[PDB]
Design a protein around this ligand. Structure first.
Ligand SMILES: [Mg+2]
Length: 251
């Protein structure tokens, strides 16, 4: 009955977690589809794959899925020409997407685009009926010189200005999981997500009816499992442990 396993790529697989590359080879001995997922506004599948190959994982490219892929999929489903308020680094993920005469607004973390004039242009697309698509809505992030504005304040500004709500496509939001699961052509109920983040990874997956496994690596702190309802289907020490459980109980 288990058809797909989604695996967070950051803190679940490396900080390389010991046993991970072996545990994954073991998971592959089954027929389960394996997907490697992350929220990102900046990173390509090619870079992420690279980083994983360095670390001795056997992962192919068609297996990495991100916040950006979710946005490309939605773009292609809605058949819209987005204005891409994205870092120049994300744009390889949108090659072949039409952006001229735009009729949609896609917004990630794009400081160089996060100025009045270009924001006002986006505003006028939304007044005209353009859908607003947000990669995610984080208030801030940490950089070399301290906390800095993330994409969330700027999504909200556009939302405030137009009295509309963005479709958010990054974790914990439902779209991230449904698009990740799209290539397995399976129900969320027939999949599991493994992450070190009880909210973004595990609660997010379980809100659409996936089984969520919280691992005590990466950004996990003791009693994180207690902050969500219901609790994670399973909380365990690491990715190799998650995997043994899956082999035992779910396959
Ligand atoms: Mg992570």
């Amino acid at each position: 009955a288990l058809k797909a396993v989604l695996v967070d790529l950051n803190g679940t697989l490396h900080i390389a977690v010991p046993g991970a590359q072996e545990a994954l080879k073991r998971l592959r001995a089954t027929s389960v589809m394996v997907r490697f997922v992350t929220n990102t506004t900046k990173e390509t599948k090619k870079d992420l794959l690279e980083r994983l190959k360095k670390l001795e994982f056997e992962i192919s490219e068609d297996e990495i899925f991100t916040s950006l892929t979710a946005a490309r999929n939605l773009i292609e489903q809605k058949q819209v020409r987005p204005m891409l308020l994205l870092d120049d680094r994300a744009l390889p993920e949108f090659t072949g997407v039409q952006t001229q005469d735009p009729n949609a607004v896609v917004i990630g973390l794009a400081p160089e685009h996060f100025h009045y004039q270009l924001l006002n242009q986006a505003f006028r697309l939304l007044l005209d009926g353009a859908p607003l698509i947000a990669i995610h809505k984080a208030r801030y992030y940490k950089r070399k010189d301290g906390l800095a504005l993330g994409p969330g304040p700027f999504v909200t500004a556009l939302e405030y200005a137009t009295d509309t709500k963005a479709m958010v496509v990054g974790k914990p939001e439902k779209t991230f999981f449904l698009e990740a699961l799209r290539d397995a052509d399976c129900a969320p109920e027939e999949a599991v997500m493994i992450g070190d983040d009880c909210r973004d990874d595990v609660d997010g997956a379980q809100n659409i009816g996936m089984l969520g496994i919280l691992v005590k690596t990466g950004k996990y702190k003791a009693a994180d499992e207690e902050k969500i309802n219901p609790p994670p289907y399973l909380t365990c020490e690491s990715f190799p442990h998650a995997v043994d459980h899956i082999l035992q109980h779910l396959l």
